Amino acid sequence: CPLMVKVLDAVRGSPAINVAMHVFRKAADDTWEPFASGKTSESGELHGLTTEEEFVEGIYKVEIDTKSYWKALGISPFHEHAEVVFTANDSGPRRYTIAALLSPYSYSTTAVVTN
Amino acid sequence: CPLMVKVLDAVRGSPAINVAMHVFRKAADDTWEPFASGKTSESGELHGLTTEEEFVEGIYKVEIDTKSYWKALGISPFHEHAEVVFTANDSGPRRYTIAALLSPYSYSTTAVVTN
Amino acid sequence: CPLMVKVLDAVRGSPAINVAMHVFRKAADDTWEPFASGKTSESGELHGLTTEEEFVEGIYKVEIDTKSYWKALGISPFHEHAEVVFTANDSGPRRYTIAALLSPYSYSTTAVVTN
Amino acid sequence: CPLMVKVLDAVRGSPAINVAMHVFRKAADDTWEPFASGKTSESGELHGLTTEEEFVEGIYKVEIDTKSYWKALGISPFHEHAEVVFTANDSGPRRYTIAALLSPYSYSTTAVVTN
Ligand SMILES: CCc1oc2c(Cl)ccc(Cl)c2c1C(=O)c1cc(I)c(O)c(I)c1
Numbered sequence: 450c451p452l453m454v455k456v457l458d459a460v461r462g463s464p465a466i467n468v469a470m471h472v473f474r475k476a477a478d479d480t481w482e483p484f485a486s487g488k489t490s491e492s493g494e495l496h497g498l499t500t501e502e503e504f505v506e507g508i509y510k511v512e513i514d515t516k517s518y519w520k521a522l523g524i525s526p527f528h529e530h531a532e533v534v535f536t537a538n539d540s541g542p543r544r545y546t547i548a549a550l551l552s553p554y555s556y557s558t559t560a561v562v563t564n
Numbered sequence: 565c566p567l568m569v570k571v572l573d574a575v576r577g578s579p580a581i582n583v584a585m586h587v588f589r590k591a592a593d594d595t596w597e598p599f600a601s602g603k604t605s606e607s608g609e610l611h612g613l614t615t616e617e618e619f620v621e622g623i624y625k626v627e628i629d630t631k632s633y634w635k636a637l638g639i640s641p642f643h644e645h646a647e648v649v650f651t652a653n654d655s656g657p658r659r660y661t662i663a664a665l666l667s668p669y670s671y672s673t674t675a676v677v678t679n
Numbered sequence: 680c681p682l683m684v685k686v687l688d689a690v691r692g693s694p695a696i697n698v699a700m701h702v703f704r705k706a707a708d709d710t711w712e713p714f715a716s717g718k719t720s721e722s723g724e725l726h727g728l729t730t731e732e733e734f735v736e737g738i739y740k741v742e743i744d745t746k747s748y749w750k751a752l753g754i755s756p757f758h759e760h761a762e763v764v765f766t767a768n769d770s771g772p773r774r775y776t777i778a779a780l781l782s783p784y785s786y787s788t789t790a791v792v793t794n
Numbered sequence: 795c796p797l798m799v800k801v802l803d804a805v806r807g808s809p810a811i812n813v814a815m816h817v818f819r820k821a822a823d824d825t826w827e828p829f830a831s832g833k834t835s836e837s838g839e840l841h842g843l844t845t846e847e848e849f850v851e852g853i854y855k856v857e858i859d860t861k862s863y864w865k866a867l868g869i870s871p872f873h874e875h876a877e878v879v880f881t882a883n884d885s886g887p888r889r890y891t892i893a894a895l896l897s898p899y900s901y902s903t904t905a906v907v908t909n
C-alpha cells in the first residue's frame with residue numbers, strides 16, 4: 450500500500466469515520482484527472498487507493514470532503530474541503546501516509562513518508 | 565480589510581516572509597477565476613487584497629506557494645502549495661483572516677471570522 | 680512588550696476570549712515561582728505581562744486554562760490545560776508571542792520570536 | 795493497552811524515533827508522582843506504559859522530551875518539552891492514544907479516545 454490516508458476529529462477525539470475523499474493526478478494540460486477515491490473506515494483510515502506500479506512520480510491532490518463530515522455532525526464548518534497537494538518522488542521505496550486532523554474552522558495535515 | 569492572510573514558520577519561529585499566494589473565486593460556470601494576489605510582508609501578513617464591495621458572496625480559494633518558500637531556504641518540502649477553500653459572506657459581510665503555520669512536511673490552517 | 684500570548688478557537692473560528700493563564704519562572708531551587716498572570720481580551724490576546732527589565736533569562740512556563748474555557752461553552756474537553764515551557768533570552772533579549780489554537784480534544788501551539 | 799503515545803516529526807515527515815517521555819499521575823498533595831516512561835519505537839509509538847487495572851481515574855501528565863530530540867538532529871528547538879495533561883475518566887471502556895506532531899518552534903497534540 451504505497452498511499453494511505455488517515456483522518457482524525459479534534460472535536461470528538463476520535464477517528465473521523467465515513468469521510469469521503471477523491472485523489473487526483475495532475476495531467477499534462479494542468480487539469481486534475483480522477484485517480485482514486487474512498488471513504489475512511491471506523492479507524493479513520495483509507496487503504497488500497499493505488500498500487501506500486503501505477504503510483505508513479507507526479508503531482509497528486511487529495512481532496513477530503515470535510516464539509517459533509519461536519520454537516521452530518523450538525524456543526525457549521527469553514528472549509529469547502531481540505532486539499533493536500535504533493536509531488537510523489539522516487540527516492541528509494543517510499544510509502545506515503547497523508548494525515549489530516551480536522552476541526553470545524555481549522556485543519557492540520559502532515560505526511561509520514563517511510564521505507 | 566475583509567480578507568487578510570497571515571503565515572508563520574514553525575521551524576524558525578518567525579513570520580514567513582515573501583510568501584506568494586493567489587486568490588481565486590469560483591465563477592458561475594464552475595471555473596476558478598483569478599481574484600487577487602500578493603506576497604507576505606516582513607510581518608508574514610498580506611493585506612489589501614480586496615474591498616467590502618468587491619468581496620461578494622462566493623466560494624474562494626487561497627493558494628499559498630509554500631513550496632517556493634521552503635526551496636529558497638534550501639528545503640525540499642512535501643506539499644506543492646497550501647490550499648484554503650471556503651464560502652465567504654453567505655450570511656452577510658464578514659472579515660476573514662486566513663492563517664497558515666508551515667513546516668516542511670506539514671501545515672496547519674485556521675480562519676478567524678469577525679462581524 | 681516582550682511576552683504576549685494569543686489564543687484562538689478552532690471550533691468557532693474566533694479569538695478565545697477570557698482565557699485565564701498563569702506564567703511561572705523556574706527558580707534556582709528548581710521550583711516554579713509565580714511570575715505573571717492574566718486573561719485574554721476580546722481579541723484573544725494578553726499583553727502587559729512583564730517588562731524587558733523584569734523578563735530576565737530563565738525557563739518560563741505558560742499554563743493556559745483551556746479546560747475552563749471549554750466548560751463555559753458547555754464542552755468537556757480532554758486537556759486540563761495547555762502548558763508551554765521554554766527558555767527565554769538565552770542569547771539576549773527577545774520578544775516572544777506564545778500562540779495556541781484550541782479544539783476540545785486537541786491544541787496546537789507555536790512561538791514567534793523577534794529581535 | 796489503555797494508554798499509548800504516538801510522535802511524528804513535521805520537519806522530516808516521519809515517525810519521531812527514540813523520543814523519551816515520562817508519564818506522571820497527580821497526587822493528593824498536587825505533586826507529580828512518576829508513573830511510567832519509555833522511548834518511542836521506529837514507528838514513533840510507545841506501548842505498554844500501564845495496564846487496565848492501574849490506569850485509574852485521575853489527572854495524568856505526559857512529558858515528552860522534544861528538546862533532546864531536536865538537539866540530536868542539530869536543530870535549535872523552542873520548547874523545553876511538550877507536556878500533555880489530561881483527566882482519565884471512566885465512561886465505558888476507553889483506550890487513549892496521546893499523539894504529538896513536532897516542529898522545532900511548534901507542536902500539535904490530540905487525543906484519540908476509543909472503545
Ligand atoms: C490524522 C492523523 C494525525 O494527524 C495529525 C496531525 Cl495533521 C497533526 C498532529 C497529529 Cl498528533 C496528528 C495525527 C495523529 O494524532 C495521529 C497520527 C497517526 I499516523 C496515528 O496513527 C494516530 I492513532 C494519530
Ligand SMILES: CCc1oc2c(Cl)ccc(Cl)c2c1C(=O)c1cc(I)c(O)c(I)c1
Pocket residue numbers: 570661663664665672673674675676685686687776778779780787788789791
Ligand atoms: C493563536 C494564534 C495561532 O496559533 C496558531 C497555531 Cl498554534 C497554529 C496555526 C495557526 Cl495558523 C495559528 C494561529 C493563527 O492563526 C494566528 C496567529 C497569529 I501570531 C495571528 O496574529 C493571527 I490574526 C492568527
